[PDB]
Amino acid sequence: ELVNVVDEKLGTAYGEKIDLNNTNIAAFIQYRGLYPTLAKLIVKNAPYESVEDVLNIPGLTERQKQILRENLEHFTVTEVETALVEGGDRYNNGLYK
Amino acid sequence: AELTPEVLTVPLNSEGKTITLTEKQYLEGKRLFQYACASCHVGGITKTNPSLDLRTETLALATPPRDNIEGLVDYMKNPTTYDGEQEIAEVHPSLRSADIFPKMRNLTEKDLVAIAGHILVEPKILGDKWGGGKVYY
Amino acid sequence: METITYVFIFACIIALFFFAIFFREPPRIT
Amino acid sequence: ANLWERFCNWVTSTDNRLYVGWFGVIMIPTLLAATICFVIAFIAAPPVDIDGIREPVSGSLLYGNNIITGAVVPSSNAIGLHFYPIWEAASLDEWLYNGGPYQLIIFHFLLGASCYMGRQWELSYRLGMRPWICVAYSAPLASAFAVFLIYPIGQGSFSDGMPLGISGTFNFMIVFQAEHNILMHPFHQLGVAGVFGGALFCAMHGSLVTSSLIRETTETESANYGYKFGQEEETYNIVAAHGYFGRLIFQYASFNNSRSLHFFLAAWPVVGVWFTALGISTMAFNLNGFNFNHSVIDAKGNVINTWADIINRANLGMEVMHERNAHNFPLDLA
Amino acid sequence: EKLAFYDYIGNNPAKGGLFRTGPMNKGDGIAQAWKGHAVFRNKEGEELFVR
Amino acid sequence: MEVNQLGLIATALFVLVPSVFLIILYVQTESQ
Amino acid sequence: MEVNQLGLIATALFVLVPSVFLIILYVQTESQQ
Amino acid sequence: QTLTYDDIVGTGLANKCPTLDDTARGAYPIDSSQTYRIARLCLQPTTFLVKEEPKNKRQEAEFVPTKLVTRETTSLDQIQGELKVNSDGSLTFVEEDGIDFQPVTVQMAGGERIPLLFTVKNLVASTQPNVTSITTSTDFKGEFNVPSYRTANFLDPKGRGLASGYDSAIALPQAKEEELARANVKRFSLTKGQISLNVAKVDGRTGEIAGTFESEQLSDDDMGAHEPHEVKIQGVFYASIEPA
Amino acid sequence: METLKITVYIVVTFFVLLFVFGFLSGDPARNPKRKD
Numbered sequence: 006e007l008v009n010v011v012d013e014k015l016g017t018a019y020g021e022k023i024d025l026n027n028t029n030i031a032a033f034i035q036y037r038g039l040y041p042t043l044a045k046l047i048v049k050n051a052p053y054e055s056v057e058d059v060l061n062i063p064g065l066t067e068r069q070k071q072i073l074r075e076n077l078e079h080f081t082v083t084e085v086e087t088a089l090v091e092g093g094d095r096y097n098n099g100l101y102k
Numbered sequence: 103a104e105l106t107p108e109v110l111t112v113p114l115n116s117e118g119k120t121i122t123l124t125e126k127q128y129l130e131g132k133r134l135f136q137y138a139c140a141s142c143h144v145g146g147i148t149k150t151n152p153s154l155d156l157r158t159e160t161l162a163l164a165t166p167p168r169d170n171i172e173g174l175v176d177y178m179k180n181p182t183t184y185d186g187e188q189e190i191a192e193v194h195p196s197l198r199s200a201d202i203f204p205k206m207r208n209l210t211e212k213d214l215v216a217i218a219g220h221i222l223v224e225p226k227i228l229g230d231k232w233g234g235g236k237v238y239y
Numbered sequence: 240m241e242t243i244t245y246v247f248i249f250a251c252i253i254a255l256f257f258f259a260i261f262f263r264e265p266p267r268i269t
Numbered sequence: 270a271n272l273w274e275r276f277c278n279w280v281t282s283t284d285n286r287l288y289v290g291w292f293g294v295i296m297i298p299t300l301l302a303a304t305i306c307f308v309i310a311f312i313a314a315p316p317v318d319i320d321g322i323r324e325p326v327s328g329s330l331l332y333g334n335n336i337i338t339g340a341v342v343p344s345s346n347a348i349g350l351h352f353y354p355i356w357e358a359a360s361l362d363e364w365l366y367n368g369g370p371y372q373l374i375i376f377h378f379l380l381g382a383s384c385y386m387g388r389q390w391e392l393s394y395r396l397g398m399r400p401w402i403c404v405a406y407s408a409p410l411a412s413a414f415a416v417f418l419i420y421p422i423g424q425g426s427f428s429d430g431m432p433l434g435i436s437g438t439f440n441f442m443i444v445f446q447a448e449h450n451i452l453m454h455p456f457h458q459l460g461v462a463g464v465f466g467g468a469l470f471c472a473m474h475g476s477l478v479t480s481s482l483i484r485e486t487t488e489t490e491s492a493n494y495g496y497k498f499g500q501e502e503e504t505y506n507i508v509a510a511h512g513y514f515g516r517l518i519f520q521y522a523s524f525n526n527s528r529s530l531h532f533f534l535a536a537w538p539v540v541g542v543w544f545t546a547l548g549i550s551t552m553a554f555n556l557n558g559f560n561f562n563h564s565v566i567d568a569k570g571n572v573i574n575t576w577a578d579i580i581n582r583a584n585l586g587m588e589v590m591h592e593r594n595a596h597n598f599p600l601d602l603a
Numbered sequence: 604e605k606l607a608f609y610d611y612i613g614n615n616p617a618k619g620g621l622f623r624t625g626p627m628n629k630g631d632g633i634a635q636a637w638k639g640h641a642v643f644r645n646k647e648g649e650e651l652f653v654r
Numbered sequence: 655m656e657v658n659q660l661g662l663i664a665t666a667l668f669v670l671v672p673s674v675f676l677i678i679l680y681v682q683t684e685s686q
Numbered sequence: 687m688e689v690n691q692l693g694l695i696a697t698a699l700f701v702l703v704p705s706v707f708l709i710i711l712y713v714q715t716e717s718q719q
Numbered sequence: 720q721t722l723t724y725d726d727i728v729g730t731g732l733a734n735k736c737p738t739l740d741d742t743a744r745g746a747y748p749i750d751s752s753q754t755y756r757i758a759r760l761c762l763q764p765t766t767f768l769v770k771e772e773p774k775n776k777r778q779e780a781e782f783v784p785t786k787l788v789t790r791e792t793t794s795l796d797q798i799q800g801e802l803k804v805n806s807d808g809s810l811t812f813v814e815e816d817g818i819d820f821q822p823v824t825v826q827m828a829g830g831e832r833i834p835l836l837f838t839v840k841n842l843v844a845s846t847q848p849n850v851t852s853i854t855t856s857t858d859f860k861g862e863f864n865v866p867s868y869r870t871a872n873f874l875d876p877k878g879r880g881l882a883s884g885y886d887s888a889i890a891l892p893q894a895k896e897e898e899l900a901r902a903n904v905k906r907f908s909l910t911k912g913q914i915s916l917n918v919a920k921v922d923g924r925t926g927e928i929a930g931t932f933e934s935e936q937l938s939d940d941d942m943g944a945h946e947p948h949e950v951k952i953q954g955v956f957y958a959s960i961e962p963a
Numbered sequence: 964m965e966t967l968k969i970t971v972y973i974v975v976t977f978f979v980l981l982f983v984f985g986f987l988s989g990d991p992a993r994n995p996k997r998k999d
């Protein structure tokens with residue numbers, strides 16, 4: 006009845022894709038054009054119900070919506086895990102090199 | 103193993119042209135990289151922002167692409183954020199900002215190409231150690 | 240019990256110091 | 270005679286079983302204060318937030334330690350180098366939480382041990398001796414200053430001073446190696462020469478004098494009874510000892526002059542320990558051991574590891590684990 | 604509860620033994636709670652009393 | 655702490671037996 | 687059997703401490719002559 | 720005044736909230752068309768009470784006083800958010816940001832240290848309806864989140880953690896893991912607290928208010944290893960209201 | 964705490980003054996040979 010919620014998350018899509026609701030902002034460096042500008046907006050606009058909601062962020066340029074569509078295949082959303090998003094850990098999760 | 107022209111051949115530009123450095127340009131780029139960059143970029147990491155390294159894979163996903171000499175020379179002239187959206191000459195040494203980054207003043211275009219070549223050659227030599235950080239020391 | 244044991248041994252040593260200094264066999268010239 | 274002069278005669282009297290002296294007037298209270306605080310703290314102090322991160326480390330016997338693991342724990346990193354006397358705390362409970370006993374102990378102890386040194390000068394003067402025993406003691410004394418005072422100064426916190434315990438000492442040594450590569454520092458290498466050589470020459474001297482004791486006793490009794498306290502004659506034959514030791518090596522590698530021999534015994538460990546104390550005191554300012562990390566590379570530029578690189582891998586394991594919750598930023602700059 | 608606890612033979616000092624060592628808690632245990640006053644009745648509703 | 659219960663007797667005997675040996679030898683030295 | 691574990695050290699000291707006392711006194715008696 | 724850092728440093732005043740004159744007993748008019756902000760909210764705790772844990776019998780538990788051991792590190796400050804005028808005329812403060820948490824350790828009689836994350840994170844606090852002015856009888860009541868006292872990277876002394884660390888007791892290789900699970904498996908709690916803010920002082924000119932607060936929240940549970948305590952915090956607060 | 968502070972200040976002051984005046988009290992002449 007006692008589980009590490011972070012290990013459980015690794016068994017979801019969080020373990021395969023950038024989880025727009027959970028993943029630390031440094032992961033958006035993996036794909037072209039997302040960091041830092043769009044990654045900041047994605048994190049700030051917080052939790053999404055579906056991946057495609059990311060296209061509705063107020064202010065995107067047409068260029069930005071295109072980059073985002075090119076990368077939807079690299080995104081997922083799962084339920085917000087408190088342990089991943091508290092502490093400002095989406096901006097700095099204690100990992101450097 | 104030795105420092106061969108196959109090792110010293112790097113992308114000149116994005117259109118697949120290549121260029122072949124000499125042992126001498128590589129060693130010069132090494133010295134110049136120590137003089138002007140290694141305080142922050144030793145071993146291909148970035149001490150003041152470890153999320154961004156000098157790996158070729160990373161440089162290739164930069165905007166504009168930086169895994170070639172011209173892209174790197176252009177970055178030393180007019181640096182930008184990883185996504186190309188912001189110019190950062192104010193806080194990154196560049197020729198544009200040689201007034202506030204004095205070490206960049208005496209640099210010539212030949213120097214920048216050497217530095218760029220060294221950055222592109224070193225991962226071919228060191229592999230994961232370049233940009234890997236202390237795990238690989 | 241283990242705390243008592245450690246303190247006991249330490250206290251014996253301090254007592255030993257007292258006797259070793261003040262009730263030593265006095266060195267005599269001869 | 271007036272009270273003051275009678276007091277002065279008593280303080281400096283050579284007939285007191287233990288010499289007091291003017292240095293003793295400060296030594297005695299300060300050593301007592303430190304000793305009493307240390308004993309009470311070692312047995313019963315509650316856990317101390319050494320690193321300032323609200324993670325108390327239990328140092329005392331009553332809180333689950335034994336003799337080997339127990340310590341008086343250094344004061345909190347939040348305090349840094351600030352002076353934290355009891356009267357600066359809102360309560361004793363606060364003072365214990367933040368590691369106040371450690372400051373009280375080390376300050377009274379350093380003051381008392383400095384006066385111990387001066388007291389050695391002082392009695393030697395009252396007895397008509399030569400004065401330099403205190404100089405020999407300056408080597409251990411300087412060593413204590415380095416790990417309890419200088420190293421905290423350079424690093425900005427008494428929380429990085431040496432803990433007053435057995436396992437706490439080991440912790441201090443391991444972290445020191447990670448942050449300074451002290452093994453690769455020549456002043457520590459000189460300290461090892463000092464103490465290995467000191468033990469060597471200690472055993473050499475004891476064995477050569479013991480080897481050449483003059484027969485004064487029978488096989489039944491201790492040979493120690495052939496020496497009488499105060500006897501004018503030497504109890505061993507130094508020519509014989511020189512004759513043995515000169516042949517063991519060669520004649521001039523052996524001492525014939527007792528005074529030269531004993532000065533050498535004094536000088537070797539003292540100098541060596543001066544250097545190792547100076548080692549801690551200058552690595553306190555981050556002038557670290559030699560760094561040969563990736564010093565050897567091949568014709569292509571591959572790194573050819575040496576034993577220095579293997580030391581560096583161990584150092585890295587120490588670095589990344591020590592004070593595992595205390596760093597938020599990638600460089601551990603103090 | 605403090606009054607009820609006095610009315611219990613485990614706290615009577617004449618219930619011990621010479622070589623039954625230690626605190627009273629080592630015998631019957633550490634008292635946690637009064638369970639309540641027990642009232643016994645038979646099937647005819649009469650109240651009965653334990654000797 | 656869950657220490658070894660035989661630790662107490664081991665320590666006590668470790669101290670007592672050797673110490674008693676020395677005391678016996680010392681006292682009979684003094685009385686001759 | 688579930689005996690009192692302190693019974694061992696109790697018994698050991700009950701034997702040892704008085705016995706040693708008597709041995710001390712006997713041996714220093716002998717060496718007087 | 721224009722006290723400078725150099726006037727304050729090391730005195731203990733940096734952990735105190737500003738106070739208002741005893742003559743600041745006016746009222747701040749609230750214009751419902753207007754939108755307001757709290758430019759600074761300061762909360763300075765003066766007493767920490769911890770609820771006792773009564774034994775079995777189920778007798779009453781009291782809140783007992785405690786000794787603070789972590790010094791003048793306890794105040795929340797530079798907190799800001801929107802002051803909303805709601806349609807029923809009530810006001811609602813919604814915290815945006817600020818220095819809105821402090822770890823605190825207090826000590827109970829007998830030596831037990833109680834750590835707690837003193838906080839008003841995500842505070843939403845509201846007045847009664849139809850508040851046309853903030854006055855010296857205005858009350859706010861609200862709730863806030865209390866996250867785990869340690870966050871996910873925290874390693875325990877044997878190297879176990881949630882987002883990092885060992886997942887077992889590595890020093891006891893062949894021990895039965897079932898009795899160690901509560902210590903091995905770290906859990907990150909999020910609980911709610913409640914706070915009352917009682918305005919007792921109002922400078923209607925400047926928009927500054929001040930008063931007392933009372934908060935109730937839970938203490939540290941050490942990432943699931945033990946039950947938390949209930950804590951009641953009392954102190955004083957200051958706020959500055961600016962039209963936005 | 965103020966009471967503790969004053970008490971230590973006075974104790975410390977007292978012992979330091981003893982040390983100072985004691986060494987000022989002709990300490991060079993307190994040796995077994997030359998009484999200056």
Ligand code: CLA
Pocket residue numbers: 294295296298299302352353354355356372373374376377380969971972973974975976978979
């Ligand atoms: C030789 C005696 C001696 C000495 C040198 C020290 C030295 C010290 N003690 Mg210890 N101490 C002693 C005896 C001594 N102690 C004894 C006997 C006790 C038992 C009561 C204590 C109990 C004690 C406690 C409980 C604490 C110390 C602390 C300290 C430190 C700071 C003291 C301080 O601020 O004084 C400042 C004093 C001066 C600067 C005076 C210098 C002399 C000048 C020339 C005269 C100035 C006069 C003075 C200002 C005014 C006179 C008094 C006035 C208020 C009426 C220092 C290491 C504190 C500590 O370790 O902090 C970590 C601490 O918490 N001491």
Ligand code: CLA
Pocket residue numbers: 457458459461462463465466469
């Ligand atoms: C196998 C034997 C051996 C030998 C020969 C050495 C030798 C040495 N070690 Mg190592 N050491 C050893 C085992 C050994 N060690 C072991 C088992 C350990 C523990 C694991 C260590 C741990 C250790 C540490 C931690 C350190 C050393 C250091 C040293 C140096 C100083 C030693 C010293 O002064 O000792 C005391 C002995 C003397 C003072 C006597 C004289 C010894 C000298 C060296 C011999 C001189 C011979 C001479 C040149 C020949 C002249 C010929 C003719 C002209 C007459 C020296 C190179 C230090 C070092 O690295 O320095 C760089 C140091 O930091 N040692």
Ligand code: CLA
Pocket residue numbers: 382408409410411412413415416441442443445446451452457460461464465542545546547548549
């Ligand atoms: C074989 C291997 C080896 C050897 C021989 C040494 C040898 C030494 N090391 Mg090195 N060390 C090693 C491996 C080794 N180390 C390794 C592997 C590491 C890395 C983990 C280190 C890390 C290391 C550090 C970090 C430090 C040393 C230091 C030292 C020295 C310790 C002794 C000293 O300071 O005396 C000097 C004497 C004293 C400190 C004693 C002071 C005594 C005071 C004045 C009085 C005490 C009174 C007492 C409380 C009362 C008694 C009363 C009683 C009678 C009742 C010595 C030169 C230390 C050093 O150089 O310190 C200066 C030091 O800080 N070592």
Ligand code: CLA
Pocket residue numbers: 621622623624625626
């Ligand atoms: C007036 C004396 C006195 C009294 C009434 C108590 C009473 C108590 N003590 Mg305390 N105690 C005392 C003295 C006393 N103590 C002293 C001197 C010590 C130091 C050794 C202690 C150390 C102590 C500890 C460490 C503990 C207690 C505890 C207790 C409680 C349990 C006692 C128990 O189990 O006894 C058992 C009694 C016996 C088994 C009787 C012994 C009978 C002797 C051995 C007979 C010997 C006969 C002799 C050899 C015949 C030879 C004669 C002839 C042939 C020559 C109780 C409240 C315990 C407790 O609960 O503490 C919280 C506990 O843990 N006591």
Ligand SMILES: CC(C)=CCC/C(C)=C/CC/C(C)=C/CC/C(C)=C/CC/C(C)=C/CC/C(C)=C/CC/C(C)=C/CC/C(C)=C/CC/C(C)=C/CC1=CC(=O)C(C)=C(C)C1=O
Pocket residue numbers: 470473474475477478507510511514515518522523524525530533
């Ligand atoms: C290949 C072949 C040779 C095979 C054929 C076999 C054959 C028969 C050979 C014979 C021919 C031959 C000799 C060949 C040559 C081969 C050769 C040169 C071999 C090399 C071997 C070699 C490594 C030599 C050993 C090196 C060695 C031990 C040197 C150490 C140098 C040195 C002097 C060190 C000691 C330092 C020092 C002097 C410390 C002093 C210590 C000290 C303070 C002692 C205290 C003390 C001193 C006193 O003094 C007295 C008084 C008293 C009181 C006292 O307290």
Ligand SMILES: CCCCCCCCCCCCCCCCCC(=O)OC[C@H](CO[C@@H]1O[C@H](CO)[C@H](O)[C@H](O)[C@H]1O)OC(=O)CCCCCCCCCCCCCCCCC
Pocket residue numbers: 305315355359360361362365829830964967
């Ligand atoms: C030669 C023998 C020397 C022995 C040295 C013993 C030092 C004893 C110091 C104990 C305090 C004595 C004064 C009693 C006054 C009441 C304060 C008291 O209860 O505190 C003693 C306790 C000690 O602290 C508590 O120790 C207990 C021991 O069972 C428990 O283990 C607790 O968990 C531990 O926290 O702390 C408090 O009560 C703090 C006071 C609360 C705020 C009041 C401020 C005023 C405090 C004045 C005290 C200054 C005394 C400094 C001592 C200097 C020593 C030279």
Ligand SMILES: CCCCCCCCCCCCCCCC(=O)OC[C@H](CO[C@@H]1O[C@H](CS(=O)(=O)O)[C@@H](O)[C@H](O)[C@H]1O)OC(=O)CCCCCCCCCCCCCCC
Pocket residue numbers: 256284285286287288289297300301304
């Ligand atoms: C641990 C406690 C130590 C003292 C601390 C005080 C706490 C309470 C003690 C109160 C009683 C004091 C009596 C002291 C007994 C004594 O020393 O007699 C020894 C001699 C005998 O007195 C001499 O003997 C003669 C007269 S008579 O014997 O005193 O009657 C004569 O020669 C001369 O006048 C006289 O001085 O006295 C002296 O030598 C004077 C100095 C002795 C003081 C040394 C104190 C050392 C403290 C430093 C220890 C630090 C930590 C050590 C831990 C290992």
Ligand SMILES: CCCCCCCCCCCCCCCC(=O)OC[C@H](CO[C@@H]1O[C@H](CS(=O)(=O)O)[C@@H](O)[C@H](O)[C@H]1O)OC(=O)CCCCCCCCCCCCCCC
Pocket residue numbers: 459460462463526528529530532533536537540541542
């Ligand atoms: C380009 C720069 C070159 C720099 C050279 C180095 C600088 C120092 C120069 C020499 C210093 C003086 C000589 C040595 C000391 C001295 O003079 O004592 C005076 C005596 C005189 O010798 C004795 O000489 C006597 C005659 S007299 O005293 O000189 O009058 C005689 O009686 C007796 O038999 C004989 O033993 O010297 C000795 O006792 C010889 C002992 C061996 C040398 C001792 C030096 C101390 C050892 C330091 C090593 C520590 C290393 C640290 C290890 C961790």
Ligand code: HEC
Pocket residue numbers: 135138139140141142143148150151154155156157160161164168174177178182183184190194195217
């Ligand atoms: C010596 C002239 C150099 C060269 C050749 C480079 N740097 Fe730096 N660098 C620093 C920081 C903080 C960044 C990231 C900035 C951001 O995007 O926000 C960088 C980045 C680079 C890159 C891009 C790497 C990538 O993967 O896209 C490159 C090619 C690069 N730098 C080259 C920090 C510093 C310094 C700290 C003061 C110093 C000095 C230098 N850099 C120097 C150089």
Ligand SMILES: CC1=C(/C=C/C(C)=C/C=C/C(C)=C/C=C/C=C(C)/C=C/C=C(C)/C=C/C2=C(C)CCCC2(C)C)C(C)(C)CCC1
Pocket residue numbers: 289293294295297298301302303305306309310313314315361370
């Ligand atoms: C007079 C004189 C003299 C003498 C002197 C003396 C002898 C002194 C002493 C002194 C002393 C004798 C001191 C002491 C001190 C002490 C201290 C200072 C302590 C402290 C402690 C503490 C504080 C503790 C605490 C705690 C802990 C740690 C834990 C648990 C709890 C408690 C709280 C308990 C002489 C001879 C020199 C001469 C001159 C004159």
Ligand code: OEX
Pocket residue numbers: 320346424428429444448591592595601602603
């Ligand atoms: O506390 Mn003790 O130790 Ca000298 O570095 Mn930084 O700090 Mn901490 O870390 Mn590594």
Ligand SMILES: [Cl-]
Pocket residue numbers: 440444590591592593
């Ligand atoms: Cl550590």
Ligand SMILES: [Cl-]
Pocket residue numbers: 595596597598
């Ligand atoms: Cl940090």
